[PDB]
């Protein structure tokens, strides 16, 4: 929106859309949190807190007018600034297809890592509890593919007991997955066996957690509340480059922990 | 709305509307805060916090992704419960015009006093700063009517210097006003002189502050944010009476302190 | 107009209009000169001098081609620059109602004081003669309200003798007015008596002169020639704030001194 001072940057429309395309690609391929959680629609740049629907009573028991504050979740606003050399973008205007945007790539990766850290591990300052903070939803597993399949079927049985009925995904670490493939030596596609024992589910390999994780895709369980989605604006010009920034206002909420099962 | 479990109370429509009329009368005549502040429209029972439009940066200066929470004002939810004898309301159904509602009257007065305390003195727990907490907007005065008129004209000059241009009101204590009338012995109507020196303003006498107070009615200066306006619901029936409650979700915000001048 | 480089400032339309509203309020409430003088319409940013309709003959008496320059009043162009923190305005974009504009307020007050100094006391460098520079239009007065009323009726008689017939206003100092009220102890509203003896006039209390002053509102007596009215533009960005400026091109002319009577 107009708060992103994009129209005041010394960048043409083509340069802005190239930066936007690069950031969108990297964000789309590196936002592992947004692959299984539900994303609540942006409420605007002015959104400040998400209602938790609770009252914290702070009055004495003898008082006649008993009152209390309303519990809410404050929104986390992040701004990561990066400088892009202006001569390289002017070369983009000259016809250069491969324009150097390494600073933009690094900043986008850092922002995606920060958002995934908030989603998975949470933030204590903002009051958000991540996926990995629900220890009561944990079941053990082994390093054998048979152990993984048995853990998956046990997780499905737990989901059925809890009333969770929907598509299931396996959020497993990349290295762990690489290893599980290693003990699978020609017998059958391990990914296909996992998907079959996931009742037609899919596998999400992410370098954001150490152990594995199983969630249900039925929806309405894992909200990602957005005030303003990932956006790029302009701050100032440092006489050789332009200092752009990536901003996003958001919070996270695990509504139903029963739709979550941690392995190992 | 339907959260107020009014339809489950053993009260007919006539009894509910009599209770509502009595509460509305007492609230209308005893809500001195709502006589000069601006009332933002109710946002619903689900409103939790009012955006302050600020960011509290909580990241280190060396971090690449600098972030911060969004500042908001939590809503104060108050519930004051009262029991009304059911036989008296059934007598209301018999044709009794003067039905005993003394408990309702006392509870309404207590709720109005609580809201005015929040508006004027504020609450530290909820982060609201009241009118009387702005000491930098204070000018001295005397116990002589001439001193009051001079203080009023000085307050108007201060308002003109600050750019505040609108209708002005005098929020003075009842006893103080009674006294100022006492030193006015037949010379001229003191209220008329005050209103003339207020540039056509009016006088609000309230037993909610000790000293006097001057505000401008131009609007957009003193917001009273309402989530749910003053409403009456039903909790339970104590085998002889019905335990009804008065609920209200609200917060207060002094946007422009320049529209406020405290006397004495 | 486009000379005010407003479109090149890192401010959205909302921020510009908030700054404009604040400046307009303060200017409207603090421009005591523009409350009784006639304001000639803006002639544009290119206006340079106001014709006085005179010729200053600079040729010798023996010359055959006698010539002379045309007398004019040069326009006074003022630029007062102020820096507004950009983070506070971005908070305005976040939803903050009370945005800090203290620098803007101080600069607006300084500009208003400068314009009133030009109007009342005048400038010797630009050739403008202010209201207080007409000593031949002076009548004595006293510190008693009766003395003020007698001075007002004498000023009206002088106006009638001079042929000035129109609405009359009293431009009196704030402190002086406060005092005159002080000697008025319950007898009658002194402002009403002054307005009645002003033949239905009004009272303008200003902290811009020491003594009092009486003028007629008939019009066409006190011109405030404007080239460009009070406007706000943008100069540069100091890497944290934006250096905006307030500009105005104007001069002043007392056409008929007979429409002016100074008290004390
Ligand atoms: C701020 C506040 C909010 C309350 N909200 C509710 C509510 O949503 N539902 C409810 O039944 N009681 C509510 N109450 C009151 C009590 O929880 C309970 O209903 C009852 O009034 C207390 O009865 P007791 O004296 O047996 O504890 C609330 C009280 C306060 C002070
Ligand atoms: C959470 C957050 C919010 C920010 N919001 C703003 C803003 O609204 N406007 C702004 O100009 N800078 C904002 N910044 C950045 C700085 O305030 C400033 O603009 C600049 O980026 C810092 O430059 P410095 O290295 O000279 O301090 C924000 C930074 C963070 C971490
Ligand atoms: C620059 C200039 C402007 C003059 N303007 C006027 C004028 O507006 N009206 C006028 O009657 N005479 C004007 N005069 C001339 C004298 O003021 C006067 O009219 C007459 O010509 C002189 O006669 P004298 O020889 O008796 O002085 C002007 C002369 C000069 C050099």
Numbering used by the authors:
A (entry chain A), B (entry chain A), C (entry chain A): 4 to 267
Quote from the publication.
Additionally, spectroscopic analysis as well as mass spectrometry confirmed that this T. maritima encapsulin is a flavoprotein that is capable of binding flavins such as flavin mononucleotide (FMN). To better characterize the flavin–encapsulin interaction, we determined the cryo-EM structure of the purified encapsulin complex at 3.3 Å resolution. To obtain a high-resolution structure of the encapsulin shell and fit the flavin molecule, icosahedral symmetry was imposed. The high-resolution cryo-EM structure of the shell revealed that an FMN molecule interacts intimately with a tryptophan, W90, between two shell subunits. However, upon close examination, there is additional density near W90 that corresponds to a flavin undergoing π–stacking with the tryptophan. While free, oxidized flavins have a well-characterized fluorescence profile with excitation at ~ 450 nm and emission at ~ 530 nm, purified T. maritima encapsulin displayed no such fluorescence. However, denaturation of the encapsulin sample in 7 M guanidinium chloride resulted in a canonical free flavin fluorescence profile. This suggests that the encapsulin quenches bound flavins. To probe the importance of the W90 residue for flavin binding, a W90E mutation was made to remove the π–stacking interaction. However, no yellow coloration was observed in the W90E sample during purification, and biochemical experiments revealed no flavin characteristics present for the W90E mutant encapsulin.
